[model samples]
Target chain A: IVEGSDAEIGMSPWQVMLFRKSPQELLCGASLISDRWVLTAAHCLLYPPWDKNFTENDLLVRIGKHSRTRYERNIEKISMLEKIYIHPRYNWRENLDRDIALMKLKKPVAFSDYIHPVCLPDRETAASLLQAGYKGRVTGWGNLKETGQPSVLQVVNLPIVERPVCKDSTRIRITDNMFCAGYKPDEGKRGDACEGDAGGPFVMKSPFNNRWYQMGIVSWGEGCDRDGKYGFYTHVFRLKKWIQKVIDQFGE
Target chain B: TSEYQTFFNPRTFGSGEADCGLRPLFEKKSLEDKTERELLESYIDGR
Candidate 1:
């Protein structure tokens, strides 16, 4: 998170951090949508899917985390990954359409106050909250810049930047599969998503039931907290069917 | 019919033609094979 504030533990219970095995190098953020399944960006995959080798054994995820660099602060549960399912339509080089993925865990944890799954918005719920200027919250351990990285979780509030204006603003395709949100320079806003923040959940709370629902997954952007530049995300509501199919096929 | 509408309203890019599909940070998919960190940075940063 760029130009954001630190978040406390249990605030985003579904949030998880991806890391490399042993050395524990952080990669990106993810959201636990089910006990065994996590939702994230396909671009977060560490290696190509077709390589004869499967280094998935080296992948790990930590839930109920707050501090990023504190080993003594290790109260989070780390799980070994089983497999990763990158969307077939994930064409990052050509266009970033369908830039989402699902990862399964060898161990699934039951819901706890410190660890829980985020709610996925249904069609009716999604349509209502997607309006212009809707307030949403995104949390991660991304950078404050490429430079003072946050020692702990950080979060930022960004209003929804609807498609027509968003599509009209940047230099990219702004595909139908994507949505956008951020503050324009005129607002004196400084918060935006950046590296190490990829694949984290972007969510809005439904007023009807007062529950947080996942709406977007951090995908790409022109620059962090730059003028007239907004962060792009995979539209989770738009691809709910595909997400369900993937989960069903793999029995998650 | 309301797939795009959420409980309301609207997404990024501008140019006379919205020439943003070509984000400079993508690294042209990579000119040469990138180191692990380089690959992660390209996708992680998303320029």
Candidate 2:
């Protein structure tokens, strides 16, 4: 088992919790975009085909908490202004490209030291991070193991890997809109999300602000903690314009 | 048919061109309906 790092660089209340419909359960990870908005992976909007008899209201976001298992000081509520506006070319069944989306809340959340927004990564900084093997952090409430077990709020730290290594590692055609980060594939490290880790943040230090910026959104991969095929994330830098457009158009 | 009606309303027609006169009717639906048939007949005659 990978030892849990005590450094707790970026773990707190600002991280948004994504949940499913009907029973209102945890689905994936999300981040605070603004006082009344959140940024998450587009694929996280996908629900079970049989459970299509639901609306965005069924999805809930719980911030101000570190552990879902412990449920300490968690603020949970249903989204009043739920919209799943996917990019035109994005096809969840076929092309997993453009795998990002935003959620607008009905009300603005009161910001605290624990609850805050993560800065966005720019194009140049993203490229540099790719060039220089920099360490990044990923957190989610997904399965603890590749095949069995689940975690309420799990944390993992992995370095950003090279583009070609990530593309070749997976069967999917990883495009420029995507980025990869995880433990060394050959070493058989026991970290990184598996099935239910979608929409988790891939945060790294921003050279501009000297703080952590959300650079990627957890998308998919072969398996959890798998060797030779880590995990893939939707590159936030590539979709910076789209994110801004969303904020400008509907955001308050 | 009703999907767009919830958020946005489509434009109405006049004769053969885009109806600029429809703006008043959109703003005052009751006023448009309150127009007398005799007034409408006279207006059509003038046109």
Candidate 3:
């Protein structure tokens, strides 16, 4: 079982870890959207030295595993990627505007109590979530205090910042394709998405259905849980057409 | 509520009936009524 988490094991079943093959290092986080597909940040797949050299064979996707240090019984599923689909407009050098990507698993995963898919939101639902002042949850095996990575999964609650406030605070072009969520500096206690937490889900609980829906994907942030530094995520609603197109052409 | 009032309530944007392709397996009743810890437990229980 996972320990040191504010949440219980299997609470965020769709959470995943991406690893590079050569050195076998955990690089980023992702979320399972379907049996054969996972969504992540484009920067995870194309950042720097690993950019042109990395291929589908160089990455591994792990699902249903909560603890990074220990393996749970019959819970972990590791697979090689069949293809990596980065957003066409993803210009990493320019800005993190469309920092989203999809990976097709070589084989479909068997769903279990510890492994499942997350809900992707529609445009209307996304807007409602932003307007409702919803506090969402972001979970990953990212660092707890900036010293080192955590062995067990970590979770934090962050309230969505209004677009105007986020745009002003970030001083970066907060486009329609992106949204910000985290604690403000004066909030006393602050929490945010950190390194190794990229590409994970920023999910909100639906007031109507009580089910969690993924509204954003962890993309970029100024700092990890620091005062006044909020986390930015790729707006999932704006990428609905692209996500559907990939699933339609490549899904099993 | 007046029609103008209804229009301003953002919840009306989506009727909350359509799945919109999310296809999540777990569904809890009245999540908005639960506390943060309770919601986390509910998520773990997959209700």
Share of real contacts kept by model 3?
0.04
User: Mind giving the per-residue lDDT tens digits that candidate 3 earns over A6-120?
Assistant: 5565677788889888786888899876677788999988877455436799999888887877756677998899899999998677668899999988877776656777667
| DockQ comparisons of all candidates to the true complex | 0.02, 0.01, 0.07
Each prediction's RMSD to truth:
14.2, 20.6, 7.8
CAPRI-style grade of the A/B interface in model 1: incorrect
Error of 3 at B40 (Å): 10
The digit string of per-residue lDDT tens for model 2 on A1-252 reads 122222231243347777665565767788775566677877777534424323467677776555565555434433454555555555576547888887776656665535666556556666765442566667666666665333345566666777878877877777888777776745555567666668878766443333446788888787666677767788888887777666666553
How large a fraction of the reference contact set does each model reproduce?
0.00, 0.00, 0.04
Residue A25, model 1: lDDT of 90
lDDT of 1: 0.71
lDDT of 1 by residue, A1-252 (tens): 888787754667788898877565988899987667788888888335423222578788888788888652445888888778888777766557888988887777555545666667777877888766776778898878744678888888778887888898876777888988888778786688898899899977655544557899998887688788888889998988777777666743
Checking candidate 2 for backbone clashes, the offending pairs are A185-A228
Task: List the TM-score for candidate 1's chain B.
Answer: 0.20
What level of docking quality does candidate 2 show?
incorrect
lDDT (Cα, tens digit) per residue for candidate 1, span B1-47 = 11111221001100111110111222223322122232122222223
